[PDB]
RNA sequence: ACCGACGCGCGAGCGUCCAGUAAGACUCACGGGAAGCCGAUGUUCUGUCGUACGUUUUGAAAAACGAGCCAGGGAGUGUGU
RNA sequence: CAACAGCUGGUUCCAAUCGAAACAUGUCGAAGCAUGACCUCCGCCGAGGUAGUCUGUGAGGUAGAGCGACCGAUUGGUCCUGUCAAACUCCAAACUUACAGACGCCGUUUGACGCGGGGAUUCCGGUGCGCGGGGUAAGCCUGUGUACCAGGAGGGGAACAACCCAGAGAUAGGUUAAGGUCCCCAAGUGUGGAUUAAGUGUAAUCCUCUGAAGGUGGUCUCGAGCCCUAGACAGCCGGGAUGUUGGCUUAGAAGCAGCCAUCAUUUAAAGAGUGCGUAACAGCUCACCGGCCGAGGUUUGAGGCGCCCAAAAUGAUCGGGACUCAAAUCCACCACCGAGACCUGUCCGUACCACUCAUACUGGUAAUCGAGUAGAUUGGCGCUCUAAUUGGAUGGAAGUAGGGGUGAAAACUCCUAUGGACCGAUUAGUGACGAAAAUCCUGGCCAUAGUAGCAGCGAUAGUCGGGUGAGAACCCCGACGGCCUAAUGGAUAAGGGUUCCUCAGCACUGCUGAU
RNA sequence: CGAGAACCGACACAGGUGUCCAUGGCGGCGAAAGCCAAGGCCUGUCGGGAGCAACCAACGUUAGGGAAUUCGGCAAGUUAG
RNA sequence: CAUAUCGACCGAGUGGCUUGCUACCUCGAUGUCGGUUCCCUCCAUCCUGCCCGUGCAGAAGCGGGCAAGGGUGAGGUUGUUCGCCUAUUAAAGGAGGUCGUGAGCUGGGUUUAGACCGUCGUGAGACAGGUCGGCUGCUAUCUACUGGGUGUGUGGUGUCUGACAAGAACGACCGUAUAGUACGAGAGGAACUACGGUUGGUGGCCACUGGUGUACCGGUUGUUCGAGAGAGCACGUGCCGGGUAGCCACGCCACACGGGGUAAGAGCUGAACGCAUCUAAGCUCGAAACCCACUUGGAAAAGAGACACCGCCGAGGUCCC
């Protein structure tokens, strides 16, 4: 498969905070993947999350025709896309370290060994006085067809 | 608008192959498999039938005409070669085959009897190179250890007797859906060496999708493509031309909107064709009937269409689409979608209309 | 209506009756309500009516917003209690687009110079904190008069503060 | 600079002394080494900046005007006062 | 006749110093001029000058305010009481302004201030801010003061004439400004604290960033009233007496439309009843009564973050991604990033000083020099032929093409190829003497394109053999098949002018080919 | 030659340009149509191939309805000697 | 009885369909009005689905919420847009796209040159009066889209997979049973569910009916071939009568449900706040709408796929007929 450099878990983990790291590191040269896209969460929700996202109610998909653009539906692409943002994807080391990063669908990570968390981008979803409903990953991409 | 025509089938090219290739297959439980989940021969034109009404809640339980319709001539057809497929990621890919040492004496064209020396044109399926086992073993081993995917069989409809057809047989693989796998794998192996007919997977009353390329002409204008409005009178004299297609930033229009192009041709299935009858050409009667070796039950006198007389195995598929036409080749299926429940093994078929097409 | 390019002061003086004629009469009934004469001033309970804004309410604004006000002041038995006072008068005259002066926005017309807007209406103006129209009596009820002005405000372009006694 | 010493400040902290208490671009010398080895042209990649030119205009990349391209031609001169 | 135009277009080399006006008066004048303002150059003069501030001596009636101070508006009452002003004023700024002294700055080799003279350009402006007048308003019209754009780079603002920083010689190192530090993107996923759950917000200014007079016991913070250990709220739990439906009134009026009365009894306590409710009753509630543990309770105002009044047309958006104990907001704070600005080395230009014949050198000063459209000034032209002085060329002139060097520049010069005979320089003359652009002129050439046309007409015309020939779909022979019938037949006028006939031909012409 | 190449129209131009043959046959009222002689021609001068699609020019036939179309029965049709 | 419903004054907004303004853009030219044809969109929903309220008995309504899947026409006058009128209909909504659409059509109106009338003018002539007639250029370079190929990137035959993409593939109505029932004094008069059918849309097909059918057969007028026979011409069939195949529509066939998750709403358990509470965590249901189901396309999805067999000196393929 792809050669990992530092594979990163992404379970309860804010997506951007993670992909705002691995897309820095990616830039420097580092190779690799986040897994557990699927459980990777962004806060604020169950509404202006479903919409302005990619549901078949978001209407992100099915948005247009021969003009695009199209978005993504799978939890992989959904926050792969986030990764492209925060990268000068178009050219240079941009689409370079870009290609050299993959997000994997996964329940517990498909590759054998648990991968590291990042500098605290953790859910801390327990007795969330500070927390509130934030649920995303698969779920957003589940309302939307896979 | 509504938009004219409907997206769906796209782009709307010509059709590669004049043989239908079913995208999907029924999914099954409590199944053999068939191998020939799909099985088909093809069209003769058709008349109409008087049928007893089946079993509705409704009062009508009497004679009523339905278009006993396009009787297609099938079969028998032979499955030579069950093909395994195994392993992803990527997609399905063939494994190894099986064989058959029977070789219908006509399956040279589009098959065997290729020149031994290599020809610039690619050679079709021909085989004298045989390893029945080895293929069997390869499949079995790549079963326990690796995987396998749904297995299917090659098939080829013979033109034993059809008006104007030849040794050429244009057949495509039809999948077998049995139970687990290995049970079914056995089934497709038994129905390997051997031959089949419609009266196998089939049944009167049972609903089946039907697929085939529509008959039709080459490129035509917008109006009789997806329908479009003709006129107004100005460029009325000229051909119907739709208003400009898209105007803005892209100079070109992807459009999805009214363009001239090929029509005719196709490749589309129909769903839930009922199959009112099953049949033959040999004489069989409950009581005395004509003798002196009469002919098929439903073929009009005067023959039918260009390619006439039917005298062998038939099928009647009411409300004929057929999703193609005269002497082409439709493929049968099982009814994947299904709506209403199945009817019966047979229908009454009180009367069949036999008359010269003309007149 | 609507009053938009009416009550924002972006002009300067006059009223001046010398200068102007054909002023419409005000449709603002008397600015003396309740029993006058006797000094209402001896009262418990106090006042209201603070503008909290800039200016120019038209007589159309005050005259149905003030008797509207009085109407639900009637509760205190016709002639028995409070005096109502209004402060400022609708002096101030406004003119509206008569196509001859300038161009563009109002107080400009067609051409350059020329028709100033023709007289149509008058409105008093007020400051950030002025008392639009006040007076009270002893606490008749909880404060019917306080209820008054609830209605009174809500027909003023400004957001008026009740202001406690 | 610290530290420590003394003196101030409601306090954070400051003043005075300690104290202007290795390294440091260039250049050179000795020794050693390099000869595609040290020092423009064509095309291309990367970085920064960048929507022609001339004219008209308050404002032109302009959906304001001109030119397809190139060569050659193509506009302040004479007398008198 | 090269008509005239106040109107459109065009007007060809480099560099250095200065550097506008888009306003005033007159004008058959408003698409133009002249004269002033303003720009520049030259000569003169000779010691003061005044863009800033302070003080002194004067000028002033706008802001505000007020009107028992004029004036004119504008309430009520039996003197009290309610309001106003561009064309009101008993008052009265800030501030602008004349003059002087003082400090500052500037000037006497850089000669200021000023005087005289030459040359202009210019008299369609625009934007921000402050003050305006008109107008519903405007990316409106029209003033004024000022700074900017025009004619001003560079950094920032997503992009963007005039918003912010900033005014710019070349090159180099360094530090900052505005702005920014999660990624895209340099620098923080900075510190202490609090709010927000709406993705509010991540939007200084503005045609541009809307939002005015939907909801939230999510959570945090702040305030106010009342009630509490004589025990609150729940505060919570439970209960909601007799005369009697009080008298009157009323259709009814029974605690609760209204008027009058508001006693008495039995009580632990209970109003001739606090509110809801009924047609009136009923019923609920308080008011009122009983119980219960023990400490806060309840009502309400405001703010922070989040959560779930407010409608628009191809695909939603803070520049995007995306963000919530924040990457939002407010109050503080620490460290960084980040311009051509500021500092710093060398060089260049310009001005001035010293020396000098010199504007040639050399040394020196510039914190108080270095942006620029129109325009003024100054250093660095080309063409023809004549003459004097004087040079080059077949060991390759001029011209041409491509390329190197110099000059602000017009333009000069060299190298290579080509070309294959003429060509310069200096000085004095002479005159049919002058590029990127003008729907510029002439020529040449690419794309367009192996594209359109060689079909359409009431005349749809050929085909098979053969002849000739280097070559034959269309030149000729035969056969077969057709076309024209007032004409595609016959004879002629005009007009053409050898197109007629023969022989030889195919470079030209023939809508393909051709014998 | 006297003209769908000898004339005028920039051309081997579907245009324009006078006179006599008006007694060739059938037809019929006819110097009309249509067909055919005599006479002239295959030079209204590019060809070859695909059942030869879309689209266009001319045009034929369309069931039932019959101007509902449209500014308007435009266009076509109807009638016919 | 504010708040079933209607709802002034005043105040705050949103949209960008009307109108006005800008005199900002274009006068070396951005083709007019109306119509037509063809595509997309907006709400802020007219109908249909699911809901809440009622001044909700029922029936019929009225008002409000979610919701854009589908549907939402034909004619008479007028150039008209607009609007008036008629009969149907579930209803016959409105608006944006250079007042969408002239390198698409039309050319009836405005607004050239001709002319008449009225009015005004001494007159030429005029009119924000009326009227008749009055022209529509271009071979597509780029871009855009609809379809079709050749290559490049990541041995062949046959059969498949499915990332994604399209759909309205279905919408709606009438009738019968329910039932002359519930509800109601009576008059009147439902529903769930099960059936039959119609209409609009969609796909396909021609046995049947119908159209065409200058294939064909016949009748017949004129004329020419002497007559007869048999024929030519009469636009490309002279005309009339009939009509095979094929192609067609006016003909015929087929086009669900159901499941999952939601909105409005109806509820459950349930605290904060001992009670109460549909909500704060949790949960049961619940729209024609969303997803699936179903039809169509789809190895160029660069992770460029899978399987079986044949084959690398001959498997297959192109040409050929």
What is the rounded CA–CA span in Å between residue B204 and residue B342? Answer: 9
Experimental method: cryo-EM
Query: Å between A31 CA and G203 C1'?
Result: 53
Q: Tokens for B149?
A: 């995917």
E strand or H helix at B260: none
Q: Which residues contact B127 (CB under 8 A, 6 or more apart)?
A: B99, B112
Q: Are A11 and A39 in contact (CB under 8 A)?
A: yes
| Pairwise CA distance, residues B212 & B265, whole Å | 9
- CA-to-CA distance for B219 and B224, rounded, in angstroms? 10
Q: What is the DSSP string of C95-118?
A: EE--TTS--SSSS--SSSS-PPPE
Give ∠ CA B24-B26-B30 in degrees, rounded to 5. 155
Q: Is B175 exposed, middle or buried (0-12, 13-18, 19+ CB in 10 A)?
A: buried
Token output for B7 = 């997206």
The nucleotide closest to B248 (CA, C1' atoms): G144
Q: Quick one: C119 exposed, middle or buried, by C-beta within 10 A (0-12, 13-18, 19+)? A: middle
Give φ, ψ of B63 to 5 degrees.
-65, 135
Helix, strand, coil % over all residues of chain C, rounded to 5: 5, 10, 85
CA angle, corner A125, sides to A124 and A130, nearest 5?
A: 85
Q: CA dist B241 to A116, A126, B231, B244, B339, Å?
A: 63, 66, 8, 8, 40
What Rg do the C-alpha atoms of chain B give, in angstroms?
24
A and C touch with 3+ CB pairs <8 Å, answer no
Cβ pair C137, C102 in contact under 8 A: no
Which residues pair with residue B261 across a beta bridge? B220
Backbone φ and ψ of A75, nearest 5°: -55, -25
Q: How far is the CA of A143 from the C1' of G262 (A)?
A: 11
Declared resolution, Å: 11.7
What are the residues facing B207 on neighbouring strands?
Answer: B274
CB burial class (10 A; 0-12, 13-18, 19+) of residue C75? middle
Report how many Cβ contacts below 8 Å link chain A to chain B: 9
- CB-CB under 8 Å, A65 with B250: no
Which contacts (CB < 8 Å, 24+ apart) does range B87-93 have? B87/B142, B87/B146, B87/B147, B87/B149, B88/B147, B92/B149
What Cα–Cα distance (Å) separates residue A23 from each residue in A14, A95, B88? 14, 11, 30
Helix (H) or strand (E) holding B143: helix B132-144
Q: Which of A2, A64, A65, A69 to mutate to test the interface with B (most CBs of B within 10 A)?
A: A65
What are the phi and psi torsion angles at B83 (to 5°)?
A: -115, 130
Q: Which residue, B165, B199, B209, B217, is CA-closest to B42?
A: B165
For residue B249, give the nucleotide whose C1' atom is nearest its CA. Answer: G144
By CB atoms closer than 10 A (0-12, 13-18, 19+), residue A94 is middle
Q: How open is the CA angle A96-A100-A101, to the nearest 5 degrees?
A: 130
- SS3 at position B99: coil
Which residues of A make CB contacts under 8 Å with B?
Answer: 65-67
Residue among A143, A18, A11 nearest A83 (CA): A18
Cα–Cα distance measured from residue C82 to residue B280, given in angstroms and rounded to the nearest whole number: 110
**Does a cis peptide bond (omega within 30 degrees of 0) precede residue B33?**
yes
A20-48: string of b/e by CB count within 10 Å (b at 16+)?
A: bbbbebbbeebbbbbbbbbbbbbbebeee
A86 CB and strand E closer than 7 A:
yes
């Amino acid at each position: 498969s792809v050669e990992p450099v530092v594979v990163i878990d992404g379970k309860g983990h804010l997506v951007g905070r993670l992909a705002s790291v691995v897309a820095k590191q990616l830039l420097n040269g580092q190779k690799i993947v986040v897994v557990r896209a699927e459980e990777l969460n962004i806060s604020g929700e169950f509404f202006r999350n479903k919409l302005k996202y990619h549901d078949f109610l978001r209407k992100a998909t099915a948005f247009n025709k021969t003009r695009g653009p199209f978005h993504f539906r799978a939890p992989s692409r959904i926050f792969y896309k986030a990764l492209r943002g925060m990268v000068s994807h178009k050219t240079a080391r941009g689409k370079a370290a870009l290609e050299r990063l993959k997000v994997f669908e996964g329940i517990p990570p498909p590759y054998d060994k648990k991968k590291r968390v990042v500098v605290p981008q953790a859910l801390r979803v327990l007795r969330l006085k500070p927390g509130r409903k934030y649920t995303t990953l698969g779920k957003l991409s589940t309302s939307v067809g896979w | 608008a509504p938009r004219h025509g409907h997206l769906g089938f796209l782009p709307r090219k010509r059709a590669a192959s004049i043989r239908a290739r079913v995208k999907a297959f029924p999914k099954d439980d409590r199944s053999k498999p068939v191998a020939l989940t799909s099985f088909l021969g093809y069209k003769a034109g058709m008349t109409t039938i008087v049928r007893d009404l089946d079993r509705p809640g409704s009062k009508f339980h009497k004679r009523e005409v339905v278009e006993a319709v396009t009787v297609v001539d099938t079969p028998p057809v032979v499955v030579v070669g069950v093909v395994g497929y195994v392993e992803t990621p990527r997609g399905l890919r063939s494994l190894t085959t099986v064989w058959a040492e029977h070789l219908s004496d006509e399956v040279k064209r589009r098959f065997y009897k290729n020149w031994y020396k290599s020809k610039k044109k690619a050679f079709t399926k021909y085989s004298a190179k045989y390893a029945q086992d080895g293929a069997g073993i390869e499949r079995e081993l790549a079963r326990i250890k690796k995987y396998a995917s749904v297995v299917r069989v090659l098939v080829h409809t013979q033109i034993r007797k059809t008006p104007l057809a030849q040794k050429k047989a244009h057949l495509a693989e039809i999948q077998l859906n049995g139970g687990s796998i290995s049970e079914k794998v056995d089934w497709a192996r038994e129905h390997f060496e051997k031959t089949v007919a419609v009266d196998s997977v089939f049944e009167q009353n049972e609903m089946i999708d039907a697929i085939a390329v529509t008959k039709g002409h080459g490129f035509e204008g917008v109006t009789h493509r997806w329908g479009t409005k003709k006129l107004p009178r100005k460029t009325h004299r000229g051909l119907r031309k739709v208003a400009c297609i898209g105007a803005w930033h892209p100079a070109h229009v992807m459009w999805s909107v009214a363009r001239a192009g090929q029509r005719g041709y196709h490749s589309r299935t129909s769903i839930n064709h009922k199959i009112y009858r099953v049949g033959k050409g040999d004489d069989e009667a409950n009581g005395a009937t004509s003798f002196d070796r009469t002919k098929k039950t439903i073929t009009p006198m005067g023959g039918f269409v260009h390619y006439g007389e039917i005298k062998n195995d038939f099928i009647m598929v009411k409300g004929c689409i057929p999703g193609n036409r005269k002497r082409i080749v439709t493929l049968r299926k099982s009814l994947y979608t299904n709506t209403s429940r199945k009817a019966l093994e047979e229908v009454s078929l009180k009367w069949i209309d036999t008359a010269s097409k003309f007149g | 209506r609507p009053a938009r390019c009416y009550r924002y002061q972006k002009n300067k003086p006059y009223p001046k009756s010398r200068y102007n004629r054909a002023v419409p009469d005000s449709k603002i009934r008397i600015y003396d309500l309740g029993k006058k004469k006797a000094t209402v001033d001896e009262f418990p309970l106090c006042v209201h009516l603070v503008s909290n804004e800039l200016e120019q309410l038209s007589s159309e604004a005050l005259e149905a917003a003030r008797i509207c006000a009085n109407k639900y002041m009637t509760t205190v038995s016709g002639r028995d209690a409070f005096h109502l006072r209004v402060r400022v008068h609708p002096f101030h005259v406004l003119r509206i687009n008569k196509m001859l002066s300038c161009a563009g926005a109002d107080r400009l017309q067609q051409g350059m110079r020329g028709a100033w807007g023709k007289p149509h209406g008058l409105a008093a103006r007020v400051d950030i904190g002025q008392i639009i129209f006040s007076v009270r009596t002893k606490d008749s009820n909880k404060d019917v008069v306080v209820e008054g002005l609830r209605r009174a405000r809500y027909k003023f372009p400004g957001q008026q503060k009740i202001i406690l006694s």
